[PDB]
């Protein structure tokens, strides 16, 4: 309430701090939105974001590590100037890679903005405290290459998440939801090797790798009837031959599989493997099945963090109702990944979403959800009961 | 020529003997044609043919063994009443099984007739000899179940062909040819076993044996592009499920494969096996691949017997241009299997061929080809140079 | 409460009446369970149920019409002996057809029991009223052939539902739910006509109707990737040829399609039709696509009836969380179709569910849900606000 | 015989003239073989061959038209310096385009050589005549782009063949045959157009053009069972999608069809068209079926020219036993297209055939067949009975 320095006042201060930074946060958005960059090539975005935190006053009060483990990833940290337990480490993630051809059709410029905004708001609320604040470290991580590769996984492998206690990010969508079901994903490239022959003269001396590709497609297609409705299989024939006068000796398929858990994903992947090896057996070709570098995990929900986020969203006026490398993060750190409406009916990964992601209209919705994240971070800092419940829900759901 | 008892006179006598028997030979044809019987059920045909040879005058001069190794097979033998090398054993085959639904749509009634006629003609020509005839045994074998099962193979397994020196038969067709390419054949029944489930509720708990059948079909179909043009693959889905509400747990396919040699047939069969096992692997079903009881061999040509037959056919006015268990015979005894026109344009295995096979018109053509066979048998008896050349061509072509 | 003759007392009386009838209700269950009968052949079940209502005391107080529009359907009615608006007509449905081979693996014996029990309970509660009861007619309809054919649709076509105001039934399942999503369904038989030919000699003169069946299967299979996850396609190749020596001239497929609305079902059906006609075009065959006699509709929910049912279920101790011809009923009369747990983990349409459906354990759960239905019927009788809300929700959801 | 200037002496003189030119003919071969060029890009070959005929002594005695209708085609003519019926026009064809990657793997350098050699030999035999020679025009046509495009067809369209009476060429192969069955050919490019959608979110909003490609492949594959054994279908999936996250909206197939006559080719092409349009219908895509620029015709045999060629080949020591745009020529001018062994077991269109085509060993065989062609041209010049029989066989076989 209106008490000396209540939690409510700290939440208000975080909101006022985000409002105060609205103009430079929107410039941050537009600098990324207007210069879209693909996975692992976000050199401009990396420049913009590192400069953003280096310039936050007082300059150098954010400790900024550019080129953190990846050339376009960065890390930025702030903690109250204090000294003598263990400090609470709260992480905020920024995404900023675009999509080929259509630009920021997933609003990743606003994910960068919302992670920066929420971290500014937590710092400003903690600087507004008179008595020494509890020991907290605000950590911002720039995570490149969400659409391809999975920069958070590169960062997990580097140990970047091993000391975080809770991690926050949010994603622009078509409605406001504290959690939506993101699924595990496994990528594969399938290559078939046969034996060239002149189809005009001696076709029976060939081993037809195009046949292998089509049979694999047929094999997977009838299998769809026995997939679970939550399972997904999608793929293309990237190479299906070069000229009709030669029985093709090479073919190449590229496929994705998705399922709501890793146990199901491995069942689905094994059935697909059988389908690919069947096509080799039937055609007389050999086959190479090369899995992707980084399987994406499903996102593990956190009930306690979920409820505390929705309560803050309600106060802010928020009404509530694929796959991401945030799933891998959520398996090693309790986290939340809310989706938020930005005033558009367009769907993600379409050109009209690129328009909405860059719009002035989206800015209000983006800063509002950033306020919700910061208030929730303040919840975790000042409610030890919540932190333990968060940890309890994290340990329990990990039993899977 | 007009010499004492030249070979030419003996050939004339065999022709006159067949002409003399034309009425009872045609009654033999009509008795089988008018009462068609299927493989291994030719009880009436077996009765007709055994009675035919028992009644040839003088009665019992043909030594007749009814129910010879098979209930509807028979054996009939005649040799000149003589005594003291090795006698020449010349075999003549009678077929007499019909086709389901359409009756004697392959003219098998005329194969019975032509084998009987040729054997009568050889005996009559040898009885016309004054001086003691060379030692010869005329052997007639009734071989049931040509269209299904392969009665000649049952008879080979019983040893019926191990003492024959040359074997003759002929087959009504659409033109006169001393030899046509009959191919090796392998039959298979394929059964897939999956796991039933309610497709309405839990289809993903099923293993779909109908899928296996369709994938095998697809696998074989793309393979056609790499078959040799002489290869043949034909098959049906005999069982493809029972009701749509249950994921089928059983499916059944029936296939035939044909190739011009046993070496090629085994290559084709192995590629098909891969196709069937691929469908099991892709679908999660198990599979049973049960080969037929009797593979049919291709028919081995005999150049020497071929040329001597055509020379006799020319003198008679004959102008010259699938798979059968005669192929298996031709691998163990030098033989010929000429095809003969019967005055019809109809194709074998059609209803109009049943009409032609029963027609009065066909009788002239049938007796004419029987004359050609008997004259050729007389060639082998009285030309030791031909017998050795026949044996030479048989040993040489067996190198395969 | 404990008031003169409150609604609560009437609900208690309906429960006590069902308890009083428990022994004869269970005998009714066992008489159907132990003599399973298939769609339109439920002659014993029809005898059992008509006799049940004719024997309810005082005898003939239920007005019973055997052989009502269908040989095994029946209608039974009771109303308070009263006289001088419009009477409320409340319908209760009894199902009683079994499944081939496995008997009452859907618990339809308990659907018969629960519809009878609920109607007895409403009558007993209304006979317990001192002052004249409001004008109500309790209607029981025996609806045969739910698993195949759709007896409720036969009955709709006869006008049986045109004067009902609300209709009640319940279905044994694996949990207690006031509503579960039953989908629209369309059945089709597909027949392909080609041209026979001897595959041994002239396969190129055939038009292969087995090919048509396999291509249709392939066409539908790749289409699965673009179906909605709620859509269902299931089918078998009932006839796929007869013998491999003849290019098949006939093939036959049987398929079901399901979608959550009639608009979606027609989209799905049209895409399938394209798949079937494509297979004819590719193969050179003609095709006949014969839709089923009775499309099943999805079940239209009724929010008001839903909430009033759950409130009664809670008081009774009930804890809450395919396609049926009840969907067609729910499009013409406001209705509910709750599912209820019967003390088993077995799934419907399995043999172990037949065991549970016949068990003594199931009887407690069956009578409890019948109590819930009767109390809800009493809700509609004595709450005009509920009746209008029920009608409002019915008109609104019909806008689809 | 040894008569004044018999035909035999003229044939000998043509052989001696070819022997005299062997060194420069082999240089001609090596100049093309060592600098392989593809269809319509044979600028060096065109330079070599035009220069060859311009340099034949006396210089300019061959009337040479470079860049004749096509940039790399040429025409060269010689006739006896004479004057006052109609002159006999005899054509000789030179091919000279190579194959991508493997060079002159069809020996086209030797087709150029053999057509040049035969024309030199006819001229030299006619210059050796004392009395005025009959009026003859020796025409050499360079026909580019045999492997792709069909330069003879470009030349037919320009009228180049309308005044020729007989046309000669020969093709290096694996044995010596006066005629081998070259088939009619039709090329098609098939493009499918669907509707992109995000397969991750809304795959059911896509229309899958990759599905169309696979279904067309399936459609054609089952059709193989009903093709004639002489028919050929071969094709590739040139474009089968770009990335798995987007339902492909475009696919592209490239196919060839071959049959022994134009009537059969059109039947085969129509059945394939049905297969392509079926895939569009099943998938919801539209389709464009674009036939090739130039259908190749089968080669029409000429019995009279055939027999006269073989008789000359025998005297020379020659022992006798796909598709080409020479087929289109043979439909408008009586011609022959013998194949000749060149001392190699390698197959055409393989790298080892490129070795043989360039070998010193091949030169003897090439000049020998050129001698046979020239002698046959002398046959036509000096046997009016042969010319009429040639024309008779040409008119008769055109009835097709
Ligand atoms: Zn995205
Ligand atoms: Zn995203
Ligand atoms: Zn037959
Ligand atoms: Zn036969
Ligand atoms: Zn049921
Ligand atoms: Zn049911
Ligand atoms: Zn070539
Ligand atoms: Zn060539």
Swiss-Prot record, chains A, B, C, D:
CDD domains (UniProt xref): M20_ACY1L2-like
GO cellular component: nucleoplasm
Gene3D superfamilies per record: 3.30.70.360, Zn peptidases
Pfam families per UniProt: M20_dimer, Peptidase_M20
GO biological process, one term: proteolysis
Enzyme category, top tier: hydrolase
Keywords on record: Carboxypeptidase, Hydrolase, Protease
Assigned EC number: 3.4.13.4
Domain of life according to the entry: Eukaryota
GO MF annotations in UniProt: carboxypeptidase activity; dipeptidase activity; identical protein binding
Disulphide bonds in the chain: none
InterPro entries: Bact_exopeptidase_dim_dom, Peptidase_M20, Peptidase_M20/M20A_hydrolases, Peptidase_M20_dimer, Xaa-Arg_dipeptidase
SUPFAM superfamilies: Bacterial exopeptidase dimerisation domain, Zn-dependent exopeptidases
Record bears the keyword Cytoplasm: no
Catalysed transformations (reactions): beta-alanyl-L-lysine + H2O = beta-alanine + L-lysine; beta-alanyl-L-ornithine + H2O = beta-alanine + L-ornithine; N(2)-(4-aminobutanoyl)-L-lysine + H2O = 4-aminobutanoate + L-lysine; N(2)-(4-aminobutanoyl)-L-ornithine + H2O = 4-aminobutanoate + L-ornithine
Protein family per UniProt: Belongs to the peptidase M20A family.
General function of this protein: Catalyzes the peptide bond hydrolysis in dipeptides having basic amino acids lysine, ornithine or arginine at C-terminus. Postulated to function in a metabolite repair mechanism by eliminating alternate dipeptide by-products formed during carnosine synthesis.
Protein name: Xaa-Arg dipeptidase
Organism whose genome encodes this protein: Homo sapiens (Human)
Gene field: PM20D2
């Amino acid at each position: 309430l209106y008490f000396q320095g209540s939690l409510e006042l700290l939440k208000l201060r975080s909101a006022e701090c985000i409002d105060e930074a609205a103009e430079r946060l929107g410039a941050l958005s537009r600098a990324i939105w207007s210069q879209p960059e693909l996975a692992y090539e976000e050199h401009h975005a990396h420049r913009v974001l590192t400069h953003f935190f280096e310039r936050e006053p007082p300059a150098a009060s954010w400790a900024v590590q550019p080129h953190y483990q990846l050339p376009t990833a960065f890390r930025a940290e702030w903690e109250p100037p204090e000294a003598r337990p263990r400090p609470l480490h709260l992480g905020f993630l920024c995404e900023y890679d675009a999509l080929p051809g259509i630009g920021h059709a997933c609003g990743h410029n606003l994910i960068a903005e919302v992670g920066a905004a929420a971290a500014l708001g937590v710092r400003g609320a903690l600087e507004g405290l008179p008595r020494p604040p509890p020991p907290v470290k605000v950590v911002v991580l720039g995570t490149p290459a969400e659409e391809d590769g999975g920069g958070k996984i590169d960062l997990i492998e580097a140990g970047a998440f091993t000391n975080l206690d809770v991690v926050f990010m949010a994603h622009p969508s078509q409605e406001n939801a504290a959690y939506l079901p993101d699924m595990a994903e496994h990528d594969v490239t399938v290559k078939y090797y046969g034996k060239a022959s002149h189809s005009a003269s001696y076709p029976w001396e060939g081993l037809n790798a195009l046949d292998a590709a089509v049979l694999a497609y047929n094999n997977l297609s009838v299998f769809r009837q026995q997939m679970k409705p939550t399972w997904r299989v999608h793929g293309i024939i990237k190479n299906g031959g070069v000229k009709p006068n030669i029985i093709p000796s090479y073919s190449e398929l590229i496929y994705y599989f998705r399922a709501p858990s890793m146990k199901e994903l491995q069942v689905l992947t094994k059935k697909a493997e059988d389908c690919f090896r069947a096509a080799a057996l039937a055609s007389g070709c050999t086959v190479e099945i090369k899995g992707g570098a980084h399987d994406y995990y499903n996102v593990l929900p956190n009930k306690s963090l979920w409820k505390a986020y929705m309560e803050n969203g309600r106060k802010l006026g928020i009404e509530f109702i694929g796959s991401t490398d945030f799933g891998n993060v959520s398996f090693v750190v309790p986290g939340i990944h809310p989706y938020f409406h930005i005033g558009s009916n367009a769907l993600n990964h379409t050109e009209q979403y690129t328009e909405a992601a860059g719009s002035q209209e989206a800015q209000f919705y983006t800063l509002r959800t950033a306020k919700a994240l910061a208030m929730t971070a303040l919840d975790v800092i000042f409610k030890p009961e919540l932190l333990e419940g968060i940890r309890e829900d994290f340990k329990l759901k990990l039993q899977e």
